[PDB]
Design a protein around this ligand. Structure first.
Ligand SMILES: Cc1cc2nc3c(=O)[nH]c(=O)nc-3n(C[C@H](O)[C@H](O)[C@H](O)COP(=O)(O)O)c2cc1C
Length: 138
């Protein structure tokens, strides 16, 4: 499996690592890839796309790298299962509610409720691991 993410200070990056840990504990292989190093072609071969990005701008996906990436794959992901996650700071999840509605509109099936954590995981560490285990069970 593959986990693709964008992280500005390391918060969403930490979530990605913990999610991968859950998949590994379930006995499956997984690789975490920063959005800047992802190969679209390889990524599209995956049954499940696990995508993460923190809340940026004013409740939007990061603009210089993540947003263009979503735009690029939007036309080739109809019918694909996707799991969404990300860290946020002062809001209550608006960027993720929008992200989910967007993916659903592209024809994707959002397999689980998106996982959102405020700032660094710390207390929500197990929640991240568990989300990974749910994904590994689909
Ligand atoms: C320029 C900028 C804009 C942000 N916009 C939002 C926002 O609209 N809502 C929110 O809850 N957090 C917002 N945040 C806070 C980040 O989402 C939060 O600090 C998160 O933990 C960052 O995770 P990261 O290290 O993975 O990027 C913003 C942060 C920055 C730097």
């Amino acid at each position: 499996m593959k986990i693709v993410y964008w992280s500005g200070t390391g918060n969403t990056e930490k979530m990605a690592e913990l999610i991968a840990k859950g998949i590994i504990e379930s006995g499956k292989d997984v690789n975490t890839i920063n959005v800047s190093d992802v190969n679209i072609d390889e990524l599209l071969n995956e049954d499940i796309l696990i995508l993460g990005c923190s809340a940026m701008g004013d409740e939007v996906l990061e603009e210089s790298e993540f947003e263009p990436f979503i735009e690029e794959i939007s036309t080739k992901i109809s019918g694909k299962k996707v799991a969404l996650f990300g860290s946020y700071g002062w809001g209550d999840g608006k960027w993720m509610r929008d992200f989910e509605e967007r993916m659903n509109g592209y024809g994707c099936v959002v397999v689980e409720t998106p996982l959102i954590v405020q700032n660094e995981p710390d207390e929500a560490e197990q929640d991240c691991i568990e989300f990974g285990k749910k994904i590994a069970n689909i």
